[PDB]
Scaffold this active site. Structure first.
Site, PDB file in Angstrom:
ATOM      1  N   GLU A  65       0.809  -1.221   0.000  1.00 45.18           N
ATOM      2  CA  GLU A  65       0.000   0.000   0.000  1.00 45.18           C
ATOM      3  C   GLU A  65       0.843   1.274   0.000  1.00 45.18           C
ATOM      4  O   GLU A  65       1.741   1.436   0.829  1.00 45.18           O
ATOM      5  CB  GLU A  65      -0.933   0.011   1.219  1.00 45.18           C
ATOM      6  CG  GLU A  65      -1.848   1.235   1.313  1.00 45.18           C
ATOM      7  CD  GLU A  65      -2.776   1.379   0.114  1.00 45.18           C
ATOM      8  OE1 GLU A  65      -3.273   0.352  -0.398  1.00 45.18           O
ATOM      9  OE2 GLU A  65      -3.006   2.527  -0.319  1.00 45.18           O
ATOM     10  N   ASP A  93      -2.321  -5.006   1.241  1.00 43.96           N
ATOM     11  CA  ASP A  93      -1.616  -3.881   1.844  1.00 43.96           C
ATOM     12  C   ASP A  93      -0.211  -4.253   2.306  1.00 43.96           C
ATOM     13  O   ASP A  93       0.701  -3.425   2.264  1.00 43.96           O
ATOM     14  CB  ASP A  93      -2.416  -3.329   3.021  1.00 43.96           C
ATOM     15  CG  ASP A  93      -3.811  -2.906   2.620  1.00 43.96           C
ATOM     16  OD1 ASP A  93      -3.931  -2.122   1.655  1.00 43.96           O
ATOM     17  OD2 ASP A  93      -4.785  -3.370   3.261  1.00 43.96           O
TER      18      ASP A  93
HETATM   19  O1  LIG Z   1     -11.204   3.514   3.040  1.00 47.51           O
HETATM   20  C1  LIG Z   1     -10.248   3.738   2.297  1.00 47.51           C
HETATM   21  C2  LIG Z   1      -9.447   2.702   1.825  1.00 47.51           C
HETATM   22  C3  LIG Z   1      -8.379   2.963   0.964  1.00 47.51           C
HETATM   23  C4  LIG Z   1      -7.581   1.922   0.478  1.00 47.51           C
HETATM   24  C5  LIG Z   1      -6.507   2.211  -0.383  1.00 47.51           C
HETATM   25  C6  LIG Z   1      -6.666   1.608  -1.638  1.00 47.51           C
HETATM   26  C7  LIG Z   1      -6.029   0.400  -1.923  1.00 47.51           C
HETATM   27  C8  LIG Z   1      -6.175  -0.214  -3.164  1.00 47.51           C
HETATM   28  C9  LIG Z   1      -6.963   0.388  -4.137  1.00 47.51           C
HETATM   29  C10 LIG Z   1      -7.596   1.596  -3.861  1.00 47.51           C
HETATM   30  C11 LIG Z   1      -7.452   2.210  -2.619  1.00 47.51           C
HETATM   31 CL1  LIG Z   1      -8.261   3.723  -2.313  1.00 47.51          CL
HETATM   32  C12 LIG Z   1      -7.853   0.606   0.862  1.00 47.51           C
HETATM   33  C13 LIG Z   1      -8.929   0.340   1.707  1.00 47.51           C
HETATM   34  N1  LIG Z   1      -9.231  -0.889   2.122  1.00 47.51           N
HETATM   35  O2  LIG Z   1      -8.463  -1.942   1.638  1.00 47.51           O
HETATM   36  O3  LIG Z   1     -10.296  -1.074   3.195  1.00 47.51           O
HETATM   37  C14 LIG Z   1      -9.700   1.386   2.192  1.00 47.51           C
HETATM   38  O4  LIG Z   1     -10.745   1.111   3.026  1.00 47.51           O
HETATM   39 MN   LIG Z   2      -5.100  -2.074  -0.540  1.00 45.49          MN
END
Ligand SMILES: O=Cc1cc(Cc2ccccc2Cl)cc([N+](=O)[O-])c1O
Ligand SMILES: [Mn+2]
Length: 181
Positions: A65, A93
């Site tokens: 991430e 992530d």
């Molecule tokens: O809430 C924002 C958010 C942003 C991310 C970052 C992100 C990671 C991968 C693709 C788009 C985005 Cl915005 C990831 C998650 N998540 O895995 O629950 C989120 O909840």
């Molecule tokens: Mn992600």
């Protein structure tokens, strides 16, 4: 009382690096932070939680991430070719070099079980580990394995509490909390 600007709050309370990374993310996905301010805040929060999670045990986690999408996928592919771990269908992530599995981290204002179930359904992968934090201190993790000890996770939760109550202090919490999805 006096209602504050979410963008002002985000720029004041998040580390500038995090802010830049979040802006980069939103640009990349075609979203305008000037309008989607709650999403901006959420992206900052999620980034910070991922970084704190990594920081809880350095040399254990590879951070996915925060990188640009092509770079992130390059890293994932590399990890798979190097470790023999199954390739995930969506961008995780973190990678856990110790437990040899990717980690998906969620941060939600919603009911943690429901949120977890949505994540576990929407990954369709089987080895990826899921760890969900809420702003009120609730957690939910795959197989009830929480990976980090209580102190690290306490730091994370405390940061989340701080964020929630500064938002509430500025009158930002009510809007932010229901703008999820
Ligand atoms: O809430 C924002 C958010 C942003 C991310 C970052 C992100 C990671 C991968 C693709 C788009 C985005 Cl915005 C990831 C998650 N998540 O895995 O629950 C989120 O909840
Ligand atoms: Mn992600």
């Amino acid at each position: 009382g006096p209602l504050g600007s979410m963008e002002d709050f985000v720029r004041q309370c998040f580390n500038p690096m995090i802010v830049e990374l979040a802006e980069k993310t939103m640009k990349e996905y075609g979203e305008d932070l000037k309008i989607e301010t709650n999403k901006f805040a959420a992206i900052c929060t999620h980034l910070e939680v991922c970084f704190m999670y990594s920081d809880a045990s350095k040399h254990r986690f590879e951070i996915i991430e925060g990188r640009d999408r092509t770079m992130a996928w390059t890293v994932v592919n590399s990890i798979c070719n190097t470790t023999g771990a199954e390739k995930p269908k969506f961008l995780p992530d973190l990678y856990d070099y110790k437990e040899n599995r990717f980690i998906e981290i969620g941060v939600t204002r919603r009911e943690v079980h429901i949120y977890y179930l949505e994540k576990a359904n929407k990954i369709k992968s089987e080895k990826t580990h899921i760890h969900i934090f809420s702003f009120t201190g609730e957690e939910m993790a795959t197989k009830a394995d929480y990976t980090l000890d209580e102190e690290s996770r306490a730091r994370i939760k405390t940061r989340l509490f701080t964020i929630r109550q500064e938002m509430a202090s500025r009158g930002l919490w009510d809007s932010f909390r229901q703008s999820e999805r």
